[PDB]
Amino acid sequence: NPGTVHPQRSRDQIATVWIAPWVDSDNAFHQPGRVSFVVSPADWVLPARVN
């Protein structure tokens, strides 16, 4: 019979950057916060071994 593999999807890798307090153009103070973005998304990991 032809073989079987298990599709494996890799986890997303995330990155979080802390932001320091800041004032915008409308003079509202922004206390320190953080924003997260995904650097490398999830994908199928083709099989090391078919059988």
Place this chain on the structure above:
Amino acid sequence: NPGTVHPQRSRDQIATVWIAPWVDSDNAFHQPGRVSFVVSPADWVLPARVN
């Protein structure tokens, strides 16, 4: 956790100038008075220490 700061707004700085008695174009005597203006307005004082 990300830190917390207290927004601090500085006080306005004012300036008062005494005016001496004077007569205008319509011949009305103006006894000595004073007028106040703001030289530096209030603003957010960004933090010396975030933590």
